[PDB]
Design a protein around this ligand. Structure first.
Ligand code: NA
Ligand code: NA
Lengths: 295, 290
């Protein structure tokens, strides 16, 4: 039996904002950790944590997603089971409250790993999931950001369950003013995340095009798997390469198969929280990390 | 200035198929001999395979559950890691040519569905009637259910590498299913520091192991040949997931290979005046370029 670990991240700050964002990552991580403490799977727990961050309007996924060039919300998500490399993903999903829950259904109920657009909507209907009015996903802060851009990152979770299984989930609204039908890294296995019981699990955030081009999640783990490196060093190398090769900035969370974990970023900030044992860890910048008793 | 290489593959009547891969690799190699880029050359080769009704890509793509064609394609420039991809494209003759415009004309790497059609429109590319991409063999195969991808890799005269991959997907597939072909690291990968790969076979498996980047991971922790890297990458997919397929690979120094674990994989390569081609472990031919 392994001691379970759940890590979450938000994206990339009106001080009353800092505090709600911090509260949101702590809530989603404690929620996912609760699943693991009850004997649920790593997959069950990442789904739960990421669906909570989707429902939280302060984060760029589900409700609160950034807007496309058309003032529309288009969402991407992916989930992976490190035991059998099971995977599900959805891209350019519209009018769906919880894209990560649809991605998990692609994984579990179809022989495919990735559905897009109208195909993903049809499958959602076949699963009994209802469409919601598009404007319910849109916030006034995001309308404003859209106008500004015409003259935020992802959400994610990694887990290690009591049986030694790892999983990631990632979900996002994308990048503000994106072209209709743009697909970023978050639904793409290898880039937005990767999970393998032989190594570990990763979920990423940042400049999606750079993340895709270096396959950042899978890269962090190649570094971990070849030896002589801790989770910290493996993550700094992977993010180090993205920055040096492409100038692309971002962040990642990583949990090894032995339960060591890290949150690292080369952007200015990355909301994150982790729960292991009886302690909750969280922060946003280099200097504001806190640790408190779980309850 | 390096000796240039172009490799192509098909998926998984045998003479027409063999002629196709050879025609495609010679076309792409001519681009390189004229001093065109690795990207130029992979685009040209895959577009030839798209146009050839014998290969599952572009004209000749397999049909979805609704008897429709939906195509995926990707391209990557190993010099700066530039990349473009499209998924679930309908009514477009040349998906790889759209993928290349995504790479060169947008600040994005991947477009899907109706957004990709809108971008095609912005670029001046016409939609064609959908039935034009449909052959009778494919209407037939769709009945029976009630072929893989195509690819190229290239090394050019200045030492740059690139891949392209394009596919119609899998017969009777779910609407909006996306496979490995448009996904960077899985349908292919290219990086001047190592090499380029393009893949074919069971797409979900190729996605789960990121087959293309995996082949290169084996190649880059040196003292391994391109053959060994391919067998390792492919051997892991077979053993871990029982997934079969194949790949083509060329290193930054010009060594190249075509490997597969499926029953066959049409392939061709052109290097130093010679054209190599095959379908099975047996029937390999080498002839001079004319
Ligand atoms: Na949200
Ligand atoms: Na074709």
């Amino acid at each position: 039996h392994m001691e379970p670990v759940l890590v979450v991240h938000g994206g990339g700050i009106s001080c009353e904002r800092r505090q709600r964002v911090r509260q949101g990552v702590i809530r989603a991580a404690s929620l996912g950790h609760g699943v693991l403490r009850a004997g649920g799977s790593a997959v069950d727990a990442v789904e739960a944590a990421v669906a909570a961050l989707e429902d939280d309007a302060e984060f760029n996924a589900g409700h609160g997603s950034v807007l496309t060039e058309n003032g529309d919300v288009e969402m991407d998500a992916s989930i992976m089971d490190g035991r059998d490399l099971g995977a599900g993903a959805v891209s350019a999903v519209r009018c769906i409250a919880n894209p990560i829950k649809l991605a998990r259904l692609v994984m579990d109920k179809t022989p495919h790993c990735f559905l897009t657009g109208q195909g993903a909507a049809k499958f959602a209907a076949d699963m009994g999931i209802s469409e919601i009015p598009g404007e319910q996903l849109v916030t006034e802060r995001n309308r404003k950001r859209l106008e500004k851009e015409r003259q935020l990152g992802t959400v994610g979770a990694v887990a290690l369950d009591c049986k030694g299984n790892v999983a990631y989930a990632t979900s996002t609204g994308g990048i503000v003013n994106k072209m209709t039908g743009r697909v970023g890294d978050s639904p793409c296995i290898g880039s937005g995340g990767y999970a393998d019981n032989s190594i570990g699990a990763v979920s990423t955030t940042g400049h999606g095009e750079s993340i895709l081009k270096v396959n950042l999640a899978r890269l962090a783990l190649f570094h971990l798997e070849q030896g002589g490196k801790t989770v910290d060093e493996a993550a700094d190398l992977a993010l180090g390469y993205m920055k040096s090769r492409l100038k692309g900035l971002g962040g990642l969370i990583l949990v090894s198969r032995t339960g060591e974990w890290v949150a690292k970023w080369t952007s200015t900030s990355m909301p994150w929280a982790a729960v292991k044992g009886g302690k909750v860890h969280a922060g946003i910048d280099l200097n504001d990390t806190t640790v408190t008793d779980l309850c």
